[PDB]
Amino acid sequence: SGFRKMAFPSGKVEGCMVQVTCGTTTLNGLWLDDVVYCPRHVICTSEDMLNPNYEDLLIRKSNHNFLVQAGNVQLRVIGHSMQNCVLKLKVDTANPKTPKYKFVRIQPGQTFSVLACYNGSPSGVYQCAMRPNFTIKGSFLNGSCGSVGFNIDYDCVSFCYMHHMELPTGVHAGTDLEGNFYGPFVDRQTAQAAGTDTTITVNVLAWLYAAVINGDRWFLNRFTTTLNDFNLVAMKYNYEPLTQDHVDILGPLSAQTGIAVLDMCASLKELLQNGMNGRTILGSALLEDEFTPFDVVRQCSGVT
Amino acid sequence: SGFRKMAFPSGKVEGCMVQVTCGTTTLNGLWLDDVVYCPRHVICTSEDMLNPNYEDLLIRKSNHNFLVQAGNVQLRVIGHSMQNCVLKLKVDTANPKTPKYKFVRIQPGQTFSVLACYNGSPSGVYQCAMRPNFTIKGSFLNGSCGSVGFNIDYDCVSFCYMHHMELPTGVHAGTDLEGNFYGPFVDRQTAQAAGTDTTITVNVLAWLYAAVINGDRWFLNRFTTTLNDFNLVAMKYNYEPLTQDHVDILGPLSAQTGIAVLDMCASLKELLQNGMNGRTILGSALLEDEFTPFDVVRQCSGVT
Numbered sequence A, B: 001s002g003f004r005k006m007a008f009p010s011g012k013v014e015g016c017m018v019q020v021t022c023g024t025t026t027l028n029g030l031w032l033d034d035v036v037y038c039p040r041h042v043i044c045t046s047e048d049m050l051n052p053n054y055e056d057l058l059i060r061k062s063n064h065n066f067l068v069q070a071g072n073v074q075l076r077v078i079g080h081s082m083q084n085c086v087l088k089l090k091v092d093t094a095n096p097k098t099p100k101y102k103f104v105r106i107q108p109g110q111t112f113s114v115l116a117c118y119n120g121s122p123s124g125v126y127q128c129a130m131r132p133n134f135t136i137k138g139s140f141l142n143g144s145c146g147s148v149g150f151n152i153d154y155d156c157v158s159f160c161y162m163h164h165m166e167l168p169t170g171v172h173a174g175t176d177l178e179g180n181f182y183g184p185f186v187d188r189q190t191a192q193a194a195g196t197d198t199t200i201t202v203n204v205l206a207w208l209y210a211a212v213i214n215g216d217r218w219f220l221n222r223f224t225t226t227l228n229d230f231n232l233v234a235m236k237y238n239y240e241p242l243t244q245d246h247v248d249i250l251g252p253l254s255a256q257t258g259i260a261v262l263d264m265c266a267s268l269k270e271l272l273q274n275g276m277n278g279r280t281i282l283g284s285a286l287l288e289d290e291f292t293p294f295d296v297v298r299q300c301s302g303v304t
C-alpha cells in the first residue's frame, strides 16, 4: 500500500538526451535514430524572440552552425529542417541507445513523466498532467527547453511533450514531437496567458478510488447522485463535466472497490460543497487531479 | 520556475535491478559488480515469517537454491552470505552496467529517490524522505522487496535504502545496504508500530524558501522570533526542534531570498497557529517536509 506521484523509470529517455547549441544559445535535444529533435527557438537571439521569422532566421543557418553533443562526443549534422516548432537535425550516427518509440499527441487530462534536462544532461524526473487549458505545471528553469514528456509501455517509449517556454504565470507550454504546440501558444516572447484551468474530474475520482483501496475511507457517505446533478456541482467549482466515457474508464476501479461511480460522485460533491474540514486524503489537504484511472490501477497492481 | 517533488534520473539504478527467487519466493536484488544484495527474508516461507531463525534457515540453503535473473539471463551464484538482514549472493559475472557507487546510511530528515520494482523490473520512480521515526511513506506492494533508495552525485550513486516490509499502518520499513534496519524494526511478521512521526522543520523552512523564490509570498509577515520561542511552537505541533545547524544549512536560501531564517520561522509559527485559511503554497494545502535545503537549491539552480 501507499500512494505516490510516481514517474516512469527514465533510463530509456536519458539515453536519448543530447545538447544542441546554436550560436550563443544552448538547449536540449532528443536523439532517436539519426535525428535530433529540439525547439526551433534555438536559432534565436534575445532580440529575435520578440517577433521571430523562423523561416528567415533558418535561411541564415547551415548544418555546421548547429553543434550537437551527446555526453562528450560531437555528432556530425548532415541535414536540418523545420517541422512546425521543432528543428530536426539529421546526424550521421544513429543513437545506439534508441529505445522503441512512438510520437503521440496526448489529450488534456492525461498524464506523463518529464525528464528535466540542462545542457543535454538529466537533472530529475517527475510526473505531470496535460492541463485542460493545455499548459503543464512543471518545474523548469532557463536552459530546460528541449526536455521531453513521455510514457512507457513494456519497452516502448511514447514521446508526447517537448518543453518550449514558460508563461509569466509560472506555467509551462510546449509541443508534441511533431512541433505542434498544445494550446494556443506561439514560440514568441509576447504576452500570452493560459485560460481557465479546470479540474480533471475523472482523475479526482480515480484518486478517490486509490484512497479507498489504501484505507482512507472517511469521505465515503450514505449518498448517491446522477450524472446531471453531479455536473451541476462540477460546473460551480470549475470541474470538467463527467461523461458516461469517464464512468466507463472508472469501471475497473469501481469493480475492484465495490463502490459505484455515482456513489463516489456523491462523496466528491460533498468534498466540494463542505471542504475537507482539516482532514487529509492520501496525505493531501486538497483534491488531487494528476492521476488518471490508468495510473491508479498501474500503481495499485505493480505494472512494470 | 515551478516546484515539484522531483526524483533523480533512475537509469543508473535500473541497470542494477535483478530478480532473485528462493523456492516459492521472488523479490528484487541489487547487482553491483559480482554481488547481488537482496532482503534475507527471501529464504522464508509464510510460516517462517512468524518467528524466523535466519541462520538455521540459511543452513538449509545452497548456492544453487538462489535463482538470480537479470532480464532474461540466469546468473551463476558462486557464493552466499548473510550481512545483518541482507543476503549477498556472489555471482560469477560482474555487472557491466555497474555505476560508481557508495553504500551510505542516511539520517532522518534526508531525502532520496526510490525505484519501485517487481520481478527485477522497474515500475516507477518517486522521491521519499527518511521520516524522523525511521519509516518511509512510500508506494510499495507485495513483491517490491529489494527495491532501493538512492541519491546521485555527478555520476556516483549512493545507495541508502532497501525495502523490506510494510507495517499494518501502511508505512514502510527497510535497511541500509549493509543490512541494518533504519529504526527498531525487525524482519519478522510480528506486530510492529512506528513511533510518533514528527515534522522535519528544516525541510518545511526550505520549502517556504522555495515558495518565496517561485512567487508564493502571501505567508510572509512583518514579524520575527528567536530559536527558543519558535521551538516552543514547534514542540506543540510535533515539529523537530530547530538548531543553529539547521539555520546554517538554510543560509544559502536565506542569502538568495534576503529573508532571515528567524523571519521565515515567524511566518511558519503563524502558519502553524493560524492554518492556511483555504490558501495554498506551491499548490499544496499543507506544510511540505520532504524537500531538504539541498533539494531546494538543486531544483532552483538546475543541478544535473
Ligand SMILES: O=C(Cc1cccnc1)Nc1cccc(O[C@H]2CC(=O)N2)c1
Binding pocket: A041, A049, A140, A141, A142, A143, A144, A145, A164, A165, A166, A167, A168, A172, A186, A187, A188, A189, A190, A191, A192, A193, B001
Ligand atoms: O520561456 C522560455 C525559457 C524558459 C524559462 C524558464 C522555464 N522554462 C522555459 N523561453 C521562451 C521560448 C519561446 C517564447 C518565450 O516567450 C515567453 C513569453 C511567453 O508567454 N512565452 C519564451
Ligand SMILES: O=C(Cc1cccnc1)Nc1cccc(O[C@H]2CC(=O)N2)c1
Binding pocket: A001, B041, B049, B140, B141, B142, B143, B144, B145, B164, B165, B166, B167, B168, B172, B186, B187, B188, B189, B190, B191, B192, B193
Ligand atoms: O511486508 C512485507 C511485504 C510487503 C508488502 C507490501 C508492501 N511492502 C512490503 N514483508 C515482510 C517482511 C518482513 C516482515 C514482515 O512483517 C511485517 C509485519 C510488520 O509490522 N512487518 C513483512
